[PDB]
């Protein structure tokens, strides 16, 4: 599995160094350093999102360009860390205006349709297109929860939360008060949340068939980048989420599917 | 030429009825405040009447020529022969304390009525008495002596010295002297070296008065004036409105970064990013910004300015903190008082404009000071917009050796510049911005002659001119003499009511011939 190989510490460090070298040393057709200008424009307008084109990444690193579409989570995390390091080197004071630099992947060679997604595409970086039909408001979501212990008043460390399950607390050093654990509102870190709904294009839908739809999740800078009735090109991680209600309804164990959005382009 | 002030000036007028005539400028107002403090302390009756121009000066002298004998004039009536125009008597004694250096020769050589309080240790080249009064050599000396109109030492400093000799000096008088000096600096009437020397002198006085000691300045209560020396930034009113607007509307930062152009805006954004301050905090009011961002603002601003080609971003000035919340800088007071003096919405009751300007300088009229600060912000924004409009649309034409620009009637905020000081400030700011923007080496060392529609009904346009900009200029201006000669040559209808000969009025009809004659004369 590519996930196991990229999970290796030495492989992780090698990928980190390769991405740092790619960011620092990538000349253009005229020799200009593209990422210097990109980071300058990003920090000049107080953004926290850095776009990366897949074509030049493949041109300068084919191994990583092959690893990415198969393990899009850890690879993107390493890319984010390397980008943050490079930005901090270039702009030492940017730790005030931002706390995490995100990497957005553009021009992914593979393009699919909402009607041809099967279990083969699970946990893979896919690229689809469609028309937005629904857009909920921006709600806050728990990013890193800081559980406390009533037995000792000491507060446990951060616990990352995913969009697929409910995070549970760990173990206190010596007084094992697993039960009496709560959440404080002044140290927990939150993040923006928005769940859009995309459907097939009016022109591209088969006459005999009916339009299909899939749910997408937008977080952090991605929120409020779409409005209902807009044609978009969505790149994200196809993700599988259990839904017992559908199981009971259909009478057969079935799971819901959602897309964790990573890059959105409006055409 | 008066050598002693404790015996030849004060004691002469202690038991008499003085009449004070004060010209409309911040330095004159500060000197008047100090003189009023001394007079009220010594139980001396006086009458304070505003004087604006030569005609008003003559009329007001005629009104009170009999009721009073001793006359004191501040920042007026020293570059002309007052005796000939006023026609005074033997009893009348005129004390004159004015900053204009080209003093009239007749008033210099006279012991009857004109007892000049102007210091004799200044850079003044007095011509020989025998050469002038005892013939072509006399004309040569006249032309070599009255060529320029450079200003001199501050009146407020002389008043503070007079108070110091009498031991009746308080913190309130020192603050007024500081405000007068900073007013001279802001208008750019004194050289940088002279400003530094005067700042050193006032720093010595401040160190004398504010004799800090442990448990003496700790048990000392708040609400006592505490003037201190501060090496602060070169931004205008940056402690009242947001830092962003202060940067975008000043004169050093706007000219250096060429903020009138879009590339200037991009460079400004890069500068702010290099400093390391969020755009949200920078656009908020200075009193509501985060504490952490205001810890070492001066040093980081200086460094990031040094990277972006900005060197002289720090200047030496003073402060004041009389209470829990009140805290100002000298330039803030200068801008507020200047705005209150020259107002267009309050064009009615100009004497009341002077009254409000004078009242704003007391610690019991802070509300008027705040209104002055708001008006100064509006004035700065207006002059910045006008400068940008003039530069972008190329309304400045290099008509020979001197540049000529005319403000159209339909141009917004044109009524603000009918006033003299506003017009001068606009002229200097526009010249500096244009010099920073243009690339022609020859054009960078040329003077500017700005105009404005003074009065529509009579077809009179006000005209002004400033000396060419240079790294270390002598502040000497020859525009008055050239204007007068060109007016005589063209038989033009011009008026010299203002105490500065560089500012004259001119009819619309006589504009073209006057300009052509000036071009020919300066050639
Ligand atoms: Zn515990």
DSSP states along B285-343? -GGGS-TGGGSSHHHHHHHHHHHTT----EEEEEEE--SSS--EEHHHHHHHHHHHHS-
The burial class, CB within 10 Å (0-12 / 13-18 / 19+), for B91 is exposed
Experimental method: cryo-EM
How many CB atoms are closer than 10 A to CB B107? 23
CB of A232 closer than 8 Å to CB of A266:
yes
B403: helix, strand or coil: strand
Please give the Cα distance from B342 to B354 (Å, whole number). 9
Please give the Cα distance from A144 to A56 (Å, whole number). 34
CB-closest option in B266, B275, B278 to A46: B278
How many CB atoms are closer than 10 A to CB B431? 23
CB of A216 closer than 8 Å to CB of A195:
yes
CB of A195 closer than 8 Å to CB of A189:
no
For residue B223, give every residue at least 6 positions away whose Cβ sits within 8 Å of its Cβ, in sequence order, or none: B322, B323
Nearest CA in chain A to B268: A44
CB of B379 closer than 8 Å to CB of B251:
no
Distance to chain B for A89, nearest Cα, Å: 12
B115: tokens are: 């007892």
The burial class, CB within 10 Å (0-12 / 13-18 / 19+), for A184 is exposed
For residue B505, give every residue at least 6 positions away whose Cβ sits within 8 Å of its Cβ, in sequence order, or none: B454, B460, B461, B462, B463, B494, B495, B497
A101: tokens are: 């630099």
Q: Which helix (H) or strand (E) holds B454?
A: strand B448-455
Please give the Cα distance from B26 to B24 (Å, whole number). 7
> Angle at Cα A199 formed by Cα A198 and Cα A205, nearest 5°?
155
B264: helix, strand or coil: helix
Please give the Cα distance from A65 to A52 (Å, whole number). 12
C-alpha closest to that of B437 among B473, B391, B386: B391
The burial class, CB within 10 Å (0-12 / 13-18 / 19+), for B215 is exposed
**Bridge partners (DSSP) listed for residue B466:** B448
Name the phi and psi angles at B205, rounded to 5.
-65, -40
For residue B329, give every residue at least 6 positions away whose Cβ sits within 8 Å of its Cβ, in sequence order, or none: B230, B232, B239, B317, B318, B319
A:72-91 residues touching chain B, CB 8 A cutoff: 91
Nearest CA in chain B to A94: B276
Please give the Cα distance from B484 to B496 (Å, whole number). 9
DSSP one-letter string for B196-239: HHHHHHHHHHHHHHS---TTTSSSSPSSS--EEEEEEES-SSTT
Binary contact (A93, B279; C-beta < 8 A): no
HSE-CB at B63 with a 13 A cutoff on CA atoms is 11
Please give the Cα distance from B48 to B34 (Å, whole number). 13
C-alpha closest to that of A217 among A255, A266, A257, A260: A260
DSSP one-letter string for B467-503: PPP-TT------HHHHHHHHHHHHT------SSSTT-
Q: Measuring CA to CA, how many Å separate A237 from each of A121, A234, B166?
A: 9, 10, 86
- Strand pairing report for A213-219 and A189-199: antiparallel
**Residue A37 at interface with chain B, using a CB cutoff of 8 Å:** no
Beta-sheet strand order (sheet of B448-455): B403-406, B448-455, B460-466, B504-507
Distance to chain A for B269, nearest Cα, Å: 6
The DSSP code for B160 is H
Q: Measuring CA to CA, how many Å separate B445 from each of B75, B256, B399, B432, B470?
A: 30, 17, 14, 11, 7
The burial class, CB within 10 Å (0-12 / 13-18 / 19+), for A120 is exposed
Please give the Cα distance from B106 to A114 (Å, whole number). 99
The residue written with tokens 């008597």 in the block is B89
CB of B47 closer than 8 Å to CB of B68:
yes
Distance to chain B for A67, nearest Cα, Å: 35
For residue A234, give every residue at least 6 positions away whose Cβ sits within 8 Å of its Cβ, in sequence order, or none: A127, A128, A129, A130, A198, A216, A259, A261, A263, A264
Binary contact (B270, A44; C-beta < 8 A): yes
Q: What's the full length of chain B, in residues?
A: 523
HSE-CB at B466 with a 13 A cutoff on CA atoms is 25
The DSSP code for B429 is H
Please give the Cα distance from A114 to A132 (Å, whole number). 13
For residue B167, give every residue at least 6 positions away whose Cβ sits within 8 Å of its Cβ, in sequence order, or none: none
Chain centroid offset of residue A75 CA: 11
Please give the Cα distance from B145 to B128 (Å, whole number). 11
Residues in chain A within 8 Å Cβ distance of B279: 46
Please give the Cα distance from A79 to A85 (Å, whole number). 10
In this structure, is the dihedral angle defined by the CA atoms of residues A76, A79, A81 and A87, taken in order, positive or negative?
Answer: negative
Please give the Cα distance from A146 to A169 (Å, whole number). 9
Please give the Cα distance from A87 to B276 (Å, whole number). 13
HSE-CB at B450 with a 13 A cutoff on CA atoms is 25
Mutate to test the interface with A, among B276, B283, B290, B295 (most CBs of A within 10 A): B276
Q: Quick one: CA torsion of B347, B348, B352, B353, rounded to 10 degrees?
A: -10
Q: Measuring CA to CA, how many Å separate B95 from each of A161, B6, B13, B78?
A: 84, 14, 10, 10
How many CB atoms are closer than 10 A to CB B420? 19
Binary contact (A97, B274; C-beta < 8 A): no
Please give the Cα distance from A183 to A188 (Å, whole number). 8
Please give the Cα distance from A12 to B42 (Å, whole number). 86
B133: helix, strand or coil: coil
Three-state helix/strand/coil letters over chain A: CHHHHHCCHHHHHHHHHHHHHHHHCCECCCCCEHHHHHHHHHHHCCCCEEEEEHHHHHHHCHHHHHHCCCCHHHHHHHHHHHHHHHHHHHCCCCCCCCCCCEEEEECCCCCCCHHHCCHHHCCCEEEEEEEEEEECCCEEEEEEEEEECCCCCCEEEEEECCCCCCCCCCCCCCCCCCCCCCECCCCCEEEEEEEEEEECCCCCCCCCCCCCEEEEEEEHHHCCCCCCCCEEEEEEEEEEEECHHHHHHHCCCCEEEEEEEEEEEEC
Distance spanning both ends of chain A, measured CA to CA = 36
B310-324 burial: b if 16+ Cβ within 10 Å, else e:
beebebebbbbbbee
Please give the Cα distance from B73 to B28 (Å, whole number). 10
C-alpha closest to that of B405 among B475, B462, B336: B462
How many CB atoms are closer than 10 A to CB B99? 26
C-alpha closest to that of B475 among B506, B439, B502: B502
Please give the Cα distance from B69 to B88 (Å, whole number). 10
Beta-sheet strand order (sheet of B93-97): B46-50, B18-22, B70-74, B93-97, B114-116
Please give the Cα distance from B370 to B397 (Å, whole number). 39
B4: tokens are: 């002693």
Please give the Cα distance from A22 to B415 (Å, whole number). 59
Chain centroid offset of residue A146 CA: 22
CB of B485 closer than 8 Å to CB of B449:
no
Size of interface A-B (CB pairs under 8 A): 23
B145-161 burial: b if 16+ Cβ within 10 Å, else e:
ebebbbbbbbbbbbbbb
C-alpha closest to that of A263 among A74, A126, A59: A126
The burial class, CB within 10 Å (0-12 / 13-18 / 19+), for B308 is middle
Chain centroid offset of residue B93 CA: 28
HSE-CB at B416 with a 13 A cutoff on CA atoms is 21
CB of B163 closer than 8 Å to CB of B38:
yes
B480: tokens are: 């008055």
Q: Measuring CA to CA, how many Å separate A247 from each of A197, A212, B2, B44, B292?
A: 21, 20, 107, 102, 55
**Rg of chain B taking only CA atoms, in angstroms:** 24
C-alpha closest to that of B98 among B44, B47, B158, B53: B158
The burial class, CB within 10 Å (0-12 / 13-18 / 19+), for B96 is buried
CB of B71 closer than 8 Å to CB of B93:
yes
Query: In angstroms, what is the span from residue A155 Cα to ligand 1's centroid?
Result: 8
A141: tokens are: 């979501």
The residue written with tokens 């896919």 in the block is A126
How many CB atoms are closer than 10 A to CB B504? 22
Distance to chain A for B313, nearest Cα, Å: 21
Mutate to test the interface with B, among A48, A95, A96 (most CBs of B within 10 A): A96
B25: helix, strand or coil: coil
Query: In angstroms, what is the span from residue A165 Cα to ligand 1's centroid?
Result: 25
Distance spanning both ends of chain B, measured CA to CA = 38
Please give the Cα distance from B255 to B249 (Å, whole number). 10
Residues in chain B within 8 Å Cβ distance of A46: 278-279
Nearest CA in chain B to A41: B270
B165: tokens are: 């000799």
Q: How many helices (H) and strands (E) does chain B have?
A: 20, 12
For residue B347, give every residue at least 6 positions away whose Cβ sits within 8 Å of its Cβ, in sequence order, or none: none
Nearest CA in chain B to A42: B273
The DSSP code for B390 is H
Nearest CA in chain A to B269: A44
DSSP one-letter string for B162-184: HHHHTT---HHHHHHHHHHHHHH
């Amino acid at each position: 599995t590519v996930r196991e190989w990229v999970s290796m510490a030495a492989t992780r460090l090698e990928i980190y160094h390769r991405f740092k070298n790619f960011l620092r040393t990538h000349v253009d057709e005229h020799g200009h350093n593209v990422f210097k200008e990109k980071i300058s424009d990003m920090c000049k307008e107080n953004k926290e999102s850095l776009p990366v084109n897949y074509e030049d990444l493949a041109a300068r690193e084919h191994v990583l360009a092959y690893f990415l579409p198969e393990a899009p989570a850890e690879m993107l995390k390493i890319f984010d860390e390397a980008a943050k390091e490079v930005v901090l080197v270039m702009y030492p004071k940017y730790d005030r205006i931002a706390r995490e630099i995100h990497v957005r992947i553009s021009h992914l060679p593979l393009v699919e349709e909402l009607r041809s997604l099967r279990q083969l595409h699970l946990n893979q970086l896919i690229r689809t297109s469609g028309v937005v039909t629904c857009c909920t408001g921006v709600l806050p979501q728990l990013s890193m929860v800081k559980y406390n212990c009533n037995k000792c008043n000491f507060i446990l460390g951060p616990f990352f939360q995913s969009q697929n399950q409910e995070v549970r607390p760990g173990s206190c050093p010596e007084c094992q008060s697993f039960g009496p654990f709560e959440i404080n509102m002044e140290e927990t870190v939150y993040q923006n949340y928005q769940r859009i709904t995309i459907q097939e294009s009016p022109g591209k839908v088969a006459a005999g068939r009916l339009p299909r739809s899939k749910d997408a999740i937008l977080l952090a800078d991605l929120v409020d980048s779409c409005k209902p009735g807009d044609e978009i090109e969505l790149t994200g991680i196809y993700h599988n989420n259990y839904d017992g209600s559908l199981n009971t309804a259909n009478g057969f164990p079935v799971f819901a599917t959602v897309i964790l959005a990573n890059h959105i382009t409006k055409k | 030429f008066v050598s002693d002030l404790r015996k030849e000036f004060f004691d002469v007028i202690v038991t008499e009825r003085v009449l004070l005539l004060v010209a409309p400028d911040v330095d004159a107002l500060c000197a008047c405040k100090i003189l009023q403090a001394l007079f009220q302390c010594d139980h001396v009756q006086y009458t304070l009447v505003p004087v604006s121009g030569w005609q008003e000066l003559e009329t007001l002298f005629l009104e009170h020529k009999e009721q009073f004998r001793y006359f004191v004039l501040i920042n007026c009536g020293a570059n002309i022969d007052l005796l000939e125009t006023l026609q005074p008597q033997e009893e009348a004694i005129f004390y004159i304390c004015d900053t204009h250096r080209p003093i009239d020769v007749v008033n210099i050589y006279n012991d009857s009525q004109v007892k000049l309080l102007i210091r004799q240790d200044d850079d003044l080249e007095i011509p020989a008495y025998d050469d002038i009064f005892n013939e072509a050599r006399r004309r040569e000396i006249i032309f070599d002596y009255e060529q320029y109109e450079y200003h001199g030492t501050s009146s407020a400093m002389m008043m503070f010295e007079l108070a110091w000799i009498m031991s009746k000096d308080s913190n309130d008088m020192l603050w007024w002297a500081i405000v007068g000096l900073t007013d001279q600096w802001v208008q750019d009437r004194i050289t940088q070296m002279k400003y530094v020397t005067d700042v050193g002198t006032l720093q010595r006085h401040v160190s004398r008065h504010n004799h800090r000691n442990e448990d003496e300045e700790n048990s000392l209560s708040i609400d006592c004036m505490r003037i201190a020396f501060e090496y602060d930034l070169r931004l205008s009113l940056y402690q009242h409105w947001s830092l962003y607007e202060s940067i975008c509307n000043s004169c050093y930062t706007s000219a250096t970064l060429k903020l009138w152009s879009l590339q200037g805006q991009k460079k400004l954004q890069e500068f702010l990013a290099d400093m390391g301050m969020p755009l949200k905090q920078v656009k908020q009011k200075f009193n509501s910004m985060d504490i952490s961002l205001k810890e070492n603002l001066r040093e980081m601003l200086e460094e990031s300015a040094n990277k972006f080609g900005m060197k002289d971003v720090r200047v030496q000035t003073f402060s004041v903190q009389f209470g829990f919340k009140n805290k100002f800088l000298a330039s803030d007071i200068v801008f507020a008082v200047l705005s209150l003096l020259e107002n267009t919405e309050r064009d009615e009751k100009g004497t009341d404009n002077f009254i409000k300007a004078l009242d704003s300088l007391s610690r019991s009229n802070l509300d008027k000071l705040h209104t002055g600060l708001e008006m100064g912000k509006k004035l700065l924004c207006a002059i910045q917009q006008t400068v940008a409009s003039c530069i972008c649309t190329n309304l400045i034409l290099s008509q020979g050796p001197f540049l000529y620009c005319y403000l159209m009637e339909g141009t917004p905020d044109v009524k603000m510049f009918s006033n003299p000081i506003s017009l001068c400030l606009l002229c200097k700011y526009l010249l500096k911005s244009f010099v920073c923007s243009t690339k022609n080496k020859r054009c960078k060392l040329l003077p500017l002659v700005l105009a404005a529609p003074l009065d529509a009904e009579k077809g009179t346009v006000i005209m002004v001119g400033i000396p060419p900009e240079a790294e270390s200029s002598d502040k000497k201006n020859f525009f008055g003499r050239a204007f007068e000669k060109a007016a005589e040559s063209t038989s033009s209808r011009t008026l010299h009511n203002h105490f500065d000969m560089s500012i004259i009025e001119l009819r619309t009809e006589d504009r073209s011939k006057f300009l052509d004659a000036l071009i020919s004369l300066l050639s």
